[PDB]
């Protein structure tokens, strides 16, 4: 959270929250209702966003679901769609929490070597996440789209 990050900085320096930390927390608390609105819209349309993202990613890379592909098979395609759903949920978490920590502890620390061991092609994951981002921006207004795109782009960048 923004609050957790500010408090951890104060605690590590053994001091009360500074005027800048207080202003950060005030800004986050002021943005709370907008964050909740965006997160609610994303959570209500999770199935549509993931279904469209998977369609777009498999259309752009038919080799994934072709024989010999990483996602080939019912169980593997299920796991791929499940990962897309996971990343969408984590983006909603980041939007609510006002920082990238939930996305880090839950889904981005160790994902690189995880996907490396399983030979999961990271460009395909990035394509799926960009597809999810576009599906989401379709549902959100321009300002809400920008807010959600911050965390979508963070996930994309952390994958690469």
């Amino acid at each position: 959270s923004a609050i957790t990050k500010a408090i951890l900085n104060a605690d590590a320096e053994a001091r009360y929250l500074s005027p800048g930390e207080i202003d950060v927390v005030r800004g986050y608390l002021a943005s709370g209702e907008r964050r909740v609105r965006v997160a609610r819209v994303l959570s209500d349309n999770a199935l549509r966003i993931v279904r469209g993202a998977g369609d777009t990613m498999f259309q752009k890379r038919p080799d994934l679901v072709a024989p010999g592909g990483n996602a080939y098979g019912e169980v593997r395609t299920a796991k791929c769609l499940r990962d897309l759903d996971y990343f969408l949920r984590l983006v909603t978490y980041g939007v609510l929490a006002g920082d990238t920590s939930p996305i880090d502890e839950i889904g981005l620390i160790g994902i690189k070597e995880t996907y490396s061991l399983l030979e999961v092609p990271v460009p395909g994951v990035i394509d799926g996440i960009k597809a999810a981002k576009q599906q989401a921006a379709a549902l959100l207004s321009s300002e809400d789209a920008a807010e959600a795109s911050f965390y979508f782009d963070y996930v994309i960048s952390a994958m690469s």
């Binding site: 951890l8 605690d11 590590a12 320096e13 053994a14 001091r15 160790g110 070597e113």
Partner: protein, 161 residues
């Protein structure tokens, strides 16, 4: 020792994790590779990282933070209640960076590691006798910490002292 070995050892000693597990300190690593900074400077760069406060202070009591600091930067454990208490007071009134700076500037650090060696444990009585208030207790605590080095013990710090 090459810079690669020293970097791997530094991350293993200070953050107890492999370099691939972390977000590496690129610029500090490049400065150490260019000879601009010493190994000790890279060690304080590691101790100064936000990841250090997240690993060793965020969810721990100040006694645990002190034991972490001693293990990481001195290669031993706090032996007395005076030493542990002074370090805890430093963490609680001056911050983590000041306490780590105290540990690195202490004559013990220069004597054992100087400016070019990663800290390590030395389970010898010469390690503690001149340096520590209770050398035998220091040996016992350091040997226990070494014997179960993989573990992050949850036994209260003042229980051990």
């Amino acid at each position: 020792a090459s810079v690669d070995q020293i970097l791997r050892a530094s991350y293993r000693q200070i953050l107890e994790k492999e370099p691939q597990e972390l977000q590496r300190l690129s610029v500090a690593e490049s400065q150490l590779r260019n000879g601009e900074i010493s190994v000790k400077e890279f060690i304080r760069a590691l101790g100064y990282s936000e990841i250090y406060a997240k690993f060793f202070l965020a969810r721990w009591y100040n006694g645990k933070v002190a034991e972490f600091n001693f293990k990481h930067f001195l290669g031993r454990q706090p032996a007395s209640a005076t030493e542990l208490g002074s370090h805890i007071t430093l963490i609680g009134t001056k911050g983590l960076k000041v306490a780590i700076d105290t540990l690195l500037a202490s004559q013990e650090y220069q004597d054992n590691f100087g400016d070019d060696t990663v800290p390590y444990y030395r389970l010898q009585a010469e390690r503690y006798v001149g340096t520590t208030d209770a050398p035998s207790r220091a040996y016992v605590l350091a040997r226990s910490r070494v014997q179960t080095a993989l573990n992050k013990p949850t036994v209260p710090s003042y229980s051990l002292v």
